Amino acid sequence: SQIPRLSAINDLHKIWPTVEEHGAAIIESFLSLDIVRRLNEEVDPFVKIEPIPAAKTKDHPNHILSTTTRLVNVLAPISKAYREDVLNSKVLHRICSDAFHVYGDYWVLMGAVMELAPSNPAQPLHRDMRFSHPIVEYLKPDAPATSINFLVALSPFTAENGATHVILGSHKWQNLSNVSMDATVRALMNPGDALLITDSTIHCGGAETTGTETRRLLTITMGISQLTPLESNLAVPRPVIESLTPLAQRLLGWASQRSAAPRDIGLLTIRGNSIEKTMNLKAEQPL
Amino acid sequence: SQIPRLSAINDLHKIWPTVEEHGAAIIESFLSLDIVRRLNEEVDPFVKIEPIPAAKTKDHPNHILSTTTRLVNVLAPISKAYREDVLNSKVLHRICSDAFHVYGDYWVLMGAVMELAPSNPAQPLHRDMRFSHPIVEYLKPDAPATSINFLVALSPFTAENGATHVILGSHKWQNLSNVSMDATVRALMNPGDALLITDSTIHCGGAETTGTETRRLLTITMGISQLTPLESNLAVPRPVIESLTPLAQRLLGWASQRSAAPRDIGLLTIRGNSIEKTMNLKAEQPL
Ligand SMILES: COc1ccc(/C=C2/C(=O)Nc3ccccc3C(=O)N2C)cc1
Ligand SMILES: COc1ccc(/C=C2/C(=O)Nc3ccccc3C(=O)N2C)cc1
Ligand SMILES: [Br-]
Ligand SMILES: [Br-]
Ligand SMILES: [Br-]
Ligand SMILES: [Br-]
Ligand code: NI
Ligand code: NI
């Protein structure tokens, strides 16, 4: 049985309940082709200048990604398309509030463009967050997902060019003795489609087998405001931050956050006041 | 059997193992009387101007604390004693690395001075973090503590003036049917002494019964860098931040963080580089 495919528009209310049951769902046209084009254009140069993931110049090397793989994060100051269109996506926010209502507010743990070179091997079958958030492994088996991953196609995803593998129902697995590529199904997607998985879904990047095709994806890990993001926006110029919506500002950690606790005392507060109130942080000021 | 009392100096290695077994330990002379005096002096005015915890002017009201209670957090820009002496405490850092080695880096979830007025009632018996981090309630019963609380006496703690109550062994309790003030013992302390509890230790602020005494404490919640702090240092002037040690800077979230994962990819990074490297953040520049 294949990965369930849903309309971003007409099947909006069905998307999270589908992921909660099956551990994966394809969101058809998650981003318009216009947004994909503008996103591809803005990140293109930064992909090319990006050193190898485990560069000796880096003080936080990624020793896991293929040496041919390029990951570009902190996209806000690079991409008008990302910081305006993607951060304000009505579909992403309905899904996130559906997923995270039991915990409270959510924000971006990481928004990264990844480019995978021709002949990039398949990743080992894995769950995300194990190289950054050891805490996640100490949660009760039945604990609701504290993070989810929108794997957005920025180029075609085919079995040939290394489309994502998922094991359906694997997000509910405690015994991992049946973990095999034999058990996987593929995420076949056009640019703008998104594969949505949880932090518990067993999955892997597919093997690039054409030897010619470059695969690119926008990976948006959304998580509860109680978990620390992989990436920082602390160094993003204040002018760029003050050009965003209040919603987009909160997702980048440039606002206080709230838990779902009946009498919440809040996160990232300043003597009972919010970041945005204290600093007199403006919003929607065109640069 | 009473709360175990240990020397900050000669019993350093014994402190965390004592808390892990009993759920509480008194650290005698955790801060020198000089540091307490300088801390009391610097915060004094900010305590007096602090509105009631649930002020209608506040966008993050605390509806839990007594209306007579005053809490002052984000202490770094207020107190030279706090940002230099307390944030660099050799005893606090040995205890925190002992406690949190399984998770990775740790930082300040909140450093607050609390002043409790004459005739302040005893708090209900509780565990901390339940009004800010719902996630903590979904951790496995045996999961190591993700946060700990140094309750430092800034004035004398007596049974008369509302010294802290703790139930010893209560940090290992799953069944809460025996939770009663009958089961508690008191934290009798001179200024500079600290009661160290975990996020699981059942405890409460004592009742002020003299009708004359004002009790004050410095509460330092230390937690793994994977959990979001209650308070923000985002609005702290860069000159003040650049006057701290690199260690103190990390504790305030003005640096990238690392997990204990063998091939850690890190937290609050910028395209494989740290906050401090990217921003060229200086340290120990006297204002
Ligand atoms: C070649 O095999 C791999 C490579 C990566 C992972 C998984 C991760 C991870 O857990 N988190 C993220 C989340 C978003 C984007 C990237 C990553 C990432 O870098 N790693 C290391 C697994 C297997
Ligand atoms: C009158 O009864 C109470 C009042 C407070 C708590 C507990 C908390 C809490 O969970 N976290 C902290 C941590 C440090 C300092 C203060 C607080 C705080 O404000 N609350 C609400 C319990 C019982
Ligand atoms: Br890879
Ligand atoms: Br992938
Ligand atoms: Br109180
Ligand atoms: Br107390
Ligand atoms: Ni993955
Ligand atoms: Ni408490």
From Swiss-Prot, chains A, B:
Fe cation binds at residues 126, 128, 203. Its cofactor is Fe cation. GO terms for molecular function: dioxygenase activity; metal ion binding. The keyword Iron applies. It catalyses: (-)-4'-methoxycyclopeptine + 2-oxoglutarate + O2 = (Z)-4'-methoxydehydrocyclopeptine + succinate + CO2 + H2O; (Z)-4'-methoxydehydrocyclopeptine + 2-oxoglutarate + O2 = (-)-4'-methoxycyclopenine + succinate + CO2; (-)-cyclopeptine + 2-oxoglutarate + O2 = (Z)-dehydrocyclopeptine + succinate + CO2 + H2O; (Z)-dehydrocyclopeptine + 2-oxoglutarate + O2 = (-)-cyclopenine + succinate + CO2. Pathway: Secondary metabolite biosynthesis; Alkaloid biosynthesis; Mycotoxin biosynthesis. Keywords: Dioxygenase, Iron, Metal-binding, Oxidoreductase. Its EC number is 1.14.11.81. It is an enzyme of class 1 (oxidoreductase). GO terms for biological process: biosynthetic process. Iron/alpha-ketoglutarate-dependent dioxygenase; part of the gene cluster that mediates the biosynthesis of the aspoquinolone mycotoxins. Within the pathway, the iron/alpha-ketoglutarate-dependent dioxygenase asqJ acts as a (-)-cyclopenine synthase that converts 4'-methoxycyclopeptin into 4'-methoxydehydrocyclopeptin through dehydrogenation to form a double bond between C-alpha and C-beta of the O-methyltyrosine side chain. Homodimer. Belongs to the PhyH family. This is Iron/alpha-ketoglutarate-dependent dioxygenase asqJ. It comes from Emericella nidulans (strain FGSC A4 / ATCC 38163 / CBS 112.46 / NRRL 194 / M139). The gene is asqJ. The chain holds residues 117 to 403 of 416 of the full protein.
